Every structure is written in C-alpha cells, then in structure tokens.
Design an enzyme around this catalytic site. Structure first.
Site, PDB file in Angstrom:
ATOM      1  CG  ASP A 120      36.238  37.937  45.401  1.00 48.88           C
ATOM      2  OD1 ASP A 120      35.754  37.285  46.619  1.00 48.88           O
ATOM      3  OD2 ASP A 120      35.872  38.947  44.593  1.00 48.88           O
ATOM      4  CG  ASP A 165      34.180  41.524  42.714  1.00 51.64           C
ATOM      5  OD1 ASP A 165      32.982  41.661  43.329  1.00 51.64           O
ATOM      6  OD2 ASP A 165      34.904  40.703  42.535  1.00 51.64           O
TER       7      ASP A 165
END
Ligand SMILES: CCc1nc(N)nc(N)c1-c1ccc2c(c1)N(CCNC(C)=O)C(=O)C(C)(C)O2
Ligand SMILES: *[C@@H]1O[C@H](CO)[C@@H](O)[C@H](O)[C@H]1NC(C)=O
Length: 333
Positions: free
Chosen positions: A31, A219
């Site tokens: 992430d 992201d």
C-alpha cells in the site's frame, strides 16, 4: 527483488511475506497509501470473527521476536484496525529486514471478513507513519542493496485461469516485461506523500472536472479510482450512473458504450475506456453493473484529493521513485 501478487476479483492484490523465526507466512497488500506494516495477532480475541478467518502471528513461536507493546491505531478510508507494536525479521521476496510492525488485536468484521489478505505492508513515507515507526522500504534502502531507490507495481487484469500472474511488485526497479513505451514522470507535490498535481479530468470530449487543477494520490492500496463526493456526483451524472450505498451502477447493456475518462498528469493524458472502469459482467438491460470509480472524501492534510488505485494501475504500470521524489507511468503490457 520481485514479489508475485495474487489478483482477487480485480479489487484485491496481495503477496506473501515471512515474519519471525521460523517464518510465519502472511498475505499482504503493498500500500503506497499508508506507511505502517501490520498483520493479525494471536492475541486478537476470537470474538473478532475476522481473526478466526486470517493467519495470526504468534510471537511465542518466533525466536527472533523483540517486544515493544506501544499501542497503535491505523485508520484507512474503508476501515480501521488497532493493536500494538512488535519487532521481528521480515522476508520480502528474498530481502530480509528487521522491521517494527503492528500486531492487530481489533479487526472489524466489516470489512475484514471480506479480505482475502491478512495484513498490509505500507509503502508510504515515514512522514505519514503512525507512531513514527520507520517504514519497511526505508529499512530496505538502509541496507544499500537495492540497485535503485525505487519500487514498481504491475496489476494484471483479472483472470479466470490460474496461468496468469495477478500482479507484481519490484523492489529496486521496474520489469520491462510488463510495460511498453517510455515512462513519463511527474514530481511529487511534496516528499512524504505519493501525491502529484493533476491538471484536469475529462469525461468524453469535454474536460468538465478538476479544472483549475486538483490533487491525485497514487494509491496501490485502493481498489478503485476515487474523487470527492462532489466531483464524483458530477462525473457520474455525465455517465448516467446511479448512486448506490457503496458504489455506482449503470445498466449493464449501457456499460460498453460509456465514454472515455482521461486524467491529465504531468503533461500527458491517461485515458481509460469503459472496458477499463466498469465490471462488465453482463450485457443485460435488466441487470446492474458496478463502476470501478467511487466517491471518497479523503480528509486533510492528504486530501481533498482524487486517488488513483488499482483501476488506474491496471492500465498504467507504476514506478515509485524515492530518490527523485517522482512517480512514473508507462502503458502496462
Ligand atoms: C491496503 C490497506 C488500505 N490502504 C489504503 N491506502 N486505503 C485503503 N482503503 C486500504 C484498505 C483497507 C481495508 C480494505 C481494503 C483496503 N481493501 C482493498 C485492498 N487493496 C488492494 C489493492 O488489494 C479491501 O478489499 C477490503 C477487504 C474492503 O478491506
Ligand atoms: C518501542 O520502540 C520505540 C522506538 O524507539 C521506543 O521509543 C519505545 O521505547 C519502544 N517500546 C518499548 C518499551 O520497547
């Protein structure tokens, strides 16, 4: 080092990492949207069904474990987890590093009962690290072993057969095998966040959004492409989509004909076709089809901002350059 990733329904991309001695295996999402590492803990009460369904790290079985205990809470746009800090050795595609991570003791059924993965490996900057814990990539860089101070992401389109790799993360470079043409870079608005300036968003032949500029967080931990509620309402109105509880649908028979959506980044237009952003699961006019674009109000200081997630990366291979504080894009192959 490259890490093979598994693709679950085009919404979850995770790989394996080993923690402790002997190694306790975990499936985790890499992430760029967060900066902490965490996996479920054996200390998580089984009253949390999510803990009953995921791999649990047990410190009492690792000889390399180092206690700490500082509590921490991680807040994501779609859920929260809480626990305490612990230190042990972690394996990431051949590279070994002593890392401080969180042992989660509170894991909400919604949404963690829907997670194929167990934990998360934050690839963000220490500036956004909760508890000021040194991020794993920083620790890796400290070893002076990576050819380059960068990591890349490849998220394949879903597959019905087990012959294709769901995705791939490369620590130290990019895999030319999964992109073509050249990379086009954009400087980070500011080091400490994988966010870049976005010059405009267009739906069809009419840049009707993000005029005057806006923000774009790249992201890898987000399943979709998101924008503020206002922006999405406007964008969705142009598509004729209907707002549901958690997403936006459209008559499936209408999906194939939805207009192109472009994102103006660093002087290059990144265009997604309806095929790229709608889960075309049927062509029936009597069925609803979900769009891989959602509404999500990301609070300051990071937001308001659009977020380019898996829906975007699936089409554009992405390189995260730490040494130069910029992000690179190239057509995925
Ligand atoms: C990976 C951690 C994470 N990071 C960031 N920056 N945003 C999030 N919304 C999440 C986050 C939290 C809970 C989640 C999911 C993501 N995801 C998507 C994971 N993303 C990828 C690319 O696999 C889920 O599917 C469910 C189970 C809802 O639970
Ligand atoms: C946890 O690690 C931090 C990092 O320096 C340290 O300050 C803290 O004292 C540690 N907690 C304990 C008691 O191990």
């Amino acid at each position: 080092s490259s890490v093979i990733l598994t693709n679950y329904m085009d919404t979850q991309y995770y790989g394996e990492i080993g923690i402790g001695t002997p190694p306790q295996t975990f499936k985790v999402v890499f992430d760029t949207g967060s900066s902490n590492v965490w996996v479920p803990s054996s200390k998580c009460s089984r009253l949390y069904t999510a803990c009953v369904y995921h791999k649990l790290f047990d410190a009492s079985d690792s000889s390399s474990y180092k206690h700490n205990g500082t509590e921490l809470t991680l807040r994501y746009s779609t859920g929260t987890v809480s626990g305490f800090l612990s230190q042990d050795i972690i394996t990431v595609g051949g590279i070994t590093v002593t890392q401080m991570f969180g042992e989660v003791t509170e894991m909400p059924a919604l949404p963690f009962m829907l997670a194929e993965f167990d934990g998360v490996v934050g690839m963000g900057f220490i500036e956004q690290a909760i508890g000021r814990v040194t991020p794993i990539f920083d620790n890796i860089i400290s070893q002076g072993v990576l050819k380059e101070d960068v990591f890349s992401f490849y998220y394949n389109r879903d597959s019905e057969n087990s012959q294709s790799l769901g995705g791939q993360i490369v620590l130290g470079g990019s895999d030319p095998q999964h992109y073509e043409g050249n990379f086009h870079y954009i400087n980070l608005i500011k080091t400490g966040v994988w966010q870049i300036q976005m010059k405009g968003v267009s739906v069809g032949s009419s840049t009707l959004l993000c005029e005057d500029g806006c923000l774009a967080l790249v992201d890898t931990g987000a399943s979709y492409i998101s924008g503020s509620t206002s922006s999405i309402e406007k964008l969705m109105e142009a598509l004729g989509a209907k707002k549901r509880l958690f997403d936006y649908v459209v008559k499936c028979n209408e999906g194939p004909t939805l207009p192109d959506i472009s994102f103006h980044l660093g002087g290059k237009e990144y265009t997604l076709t309806s095929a790229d952003y709608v889960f075309q699961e049927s062509y029936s006019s009597k069925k609803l089809c979900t769009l891989a674009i959602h509404a999500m109000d990301i609070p300051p200081p990071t937001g308001p901002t659009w977020a380019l997630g898996a829906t975007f990366i699936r089409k554009f291979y992405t390189e995260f350059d730490r040494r130069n504080n910029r992000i690179g894009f190239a057509l995925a192959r």
